[PDB]
Amino acid sequence: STNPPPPETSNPNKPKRQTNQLQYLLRVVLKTLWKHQFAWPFQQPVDAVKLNLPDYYKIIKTPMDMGTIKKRLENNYYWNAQECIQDFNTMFTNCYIYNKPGDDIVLMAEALEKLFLQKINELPTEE
Ligand SMILES: CNC(=O)N1CCc2c(c(N3CCCc4cc(-c5cnn(C)c5)c(C(F)F)cc43)nn2C2CCOCC2)C1
């Protein structure tokens, strides 16, 4: 099997805006998670081809990763902060759906999600 194309990251047919919450999600949330010791499995789409996992995209039909989230934030793809937050949650849920609980990949996702929830609990009120 090939990999699927990555999720769409740009759409010139929908309106664009910048807000302080989206700025916070790119500059504080994404930046802090990206530099984490355990970020590297989530920084790009799961490469089922290189990792020889033929059933990954048979099980995971809504893939998401922090490289896509990065690109969507940079392209002003999100109108609402909640759209981005939902993408982060999809990434974590995909990991918990596919991977063995208590094993290395899941432990790494849990560490990132804890940090994610801490930063989101400090999401600034709309400017
Ligand atoms: C968020 N990532 C994610 O959800 N994933 C899906 C499942 C997965 C991944 C890896 N990773 C990730 C870490 C790097 C890695 C490296 C190799 C590898 C082996 N040799 N070389 C040169 C590299 C392999 C291997 F499967 F090919 C797998 C993986 N494992 N699993 C499964 C875990 C259950 O058990 C079977 C493998 C990603």
UniProtKB/Swiss-Prot annotation:
PTM note: Phosphorylation by CK2 disrupt the intramolecular binding between the bromo domain 2 and the NPS region and promotes binding between the NPS and the BID regions, leading to activate the protein and promote binding to acetylated histones. In absence of phosphorylation, BRD4 does not localize to p53/TP53 target gene promoters, phosphorylation promoting recruitment to p53/TP53 target promoters.
Subcellular location, record wording: Nucleus; Chromosome
Cross-link (Glycyl lysine isopeptide (Lys-Gly) (interchain with G-Cter in SUMO2)): K58
Site features described as Acetylated histone binding, chain residue numbers: N99
Stated consequence of mutating N99A: Abolishes binding to acetylated histones
Domain remark from Swiss-Prot or TrEMBL: The NET domain mediates interaction with a number of chromatin proteins involved in transcription regulation (NSD3, JMJD6, CHD4, GLTSCR1 and ATAD5). The C-terminal (CTD) region mediates interaction and recruitment of CDK9 and CCNT1 subunits of the P-TEFb complex. It is also required for maintenance of higher-order chromatin structure.
Function, as annotated: Chromatin reader protein that recognizes and binds acetylated histones and plays a key role in transmission of epigenetic memory across cell divisions and transcription regulation. Remains associated with acetylated chromatin throughout the entire cell cycle and provides epigenetic memory for postmitotic G1 gene transcription by preserving acetylated chromatin status and maintaining high-order chromatin structure. During interphase, plays a key role in regulating the transcription of signal-inducible genes by associating with the P-TEFb complex and recruiting it to promoters.
Protein name stated in the entry: Bromodomain-containing protein 4
Species annotation: Homo sapiens (Human)
Gene responsible for this protein: BRD4
Residues shown, of full length: 42 to 168 of 1362
